Amino acid sequence: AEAFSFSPSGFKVSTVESILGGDVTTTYLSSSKSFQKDFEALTLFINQYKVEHVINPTKEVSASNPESYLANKNGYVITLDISIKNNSKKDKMYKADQISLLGASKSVGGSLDNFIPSGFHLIGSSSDPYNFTAGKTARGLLTFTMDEATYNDLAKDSQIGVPDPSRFDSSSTKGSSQDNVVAPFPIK
């Protein structure tokens, strides 16, 4: 496999190495579906994910680009291939960058941009990437970027926190009605 894609072989190609250089290794790969949650209207699937260890990065990265966090230190990038299926007849909002990884004493927020090539972003609709068209399934990437200590903190019994889409639904007026999921999410 030469170019990154959502296929089983394409997914193994390192966007991270293309950006940071250095010594990059895939330390964990989960190539089969590992999560499905049916909320009221949206179903979220995790199709596959990978964990990459970057040491001794060597490429130039714009200091203002959030990816630069790992341009001058070792760390890990965890890339998830996710799908959001809208089962409703109405468009629904979701903000997948609000998904987090939960470790022992640290948590890491998701990104819909870091280490994600054009063509592979999670986009609900052209009018608004956060608005998921009725009936459709959108597929794209979500990444978590961290230093080595943070990976080590998450290494055993990490979880993934997935907010209820109701947080983003203007008709929902009680925060306590949210069914926010916390699920096992091994990264080692």
Determine which residue in the list 38, 40, 157, 179 makes contact with Na ion, applying CB under 5 A: 157
CB 166 within 8 A of CB 178: yes
Tokens representing 67 are 């990816």
Told to check if 46 binds its own copies by CB under 8 A, we report: no
Contact call for residues 70 and 54 (beta carbons, < 8 A): yes
What tokens appear for 188 in the block? 């080692």
Q: Which does 10 bind (CB under 5 to 8 A by kind): its own copies, Na ion, none?
A: none
- Which CB atom, from 125 or from 178, has the smaller least distance to its own copies? 178
Tell me if 102 contacts Na ion by CB under 5 A.
yes
Q: What are phi and psi of 18, to 5 degrees?
A: -65, -25
How many whole angstroms separate alpha carbon 70 and alpha carbon 30? Answer: 23
> Which listed range, 38-46, 66-74, 88-96, 118-126, lies at the site for its own copies (CB under 8 A)?
66-74
Minimum distance, C-beta of residue 161 to Na ion, in the bound complex (Å): 9
Count of all residues that appear for the chain in the document: 188
Which DSSP state fits 96?
Answer: G
Residue 103 CB, nearest approach to its own copies (Å): 6
SS3 state of residue 79:
strand
114 is in an annotated binding site: yes
- Contacts with its own copies by CB under 8 A: the residue count is 34
Using CB under 8 A as the binding rule, whether residue 170 contacts its own copies is answered as no
| Phi and psi angles of residue 10, each rounded to the nearest 5 degrees, phi first | -60, -35
In the numeric block, which tokens belong to residue 59? 């490429």
String marking each residue 74-113 x if it binds its own copies according to CB under 8 A: -x------------------------x-xxxxxxxx-x--
Residues lying near Na ion in the complex (CB under 5 A) are found at 102, 157, 159
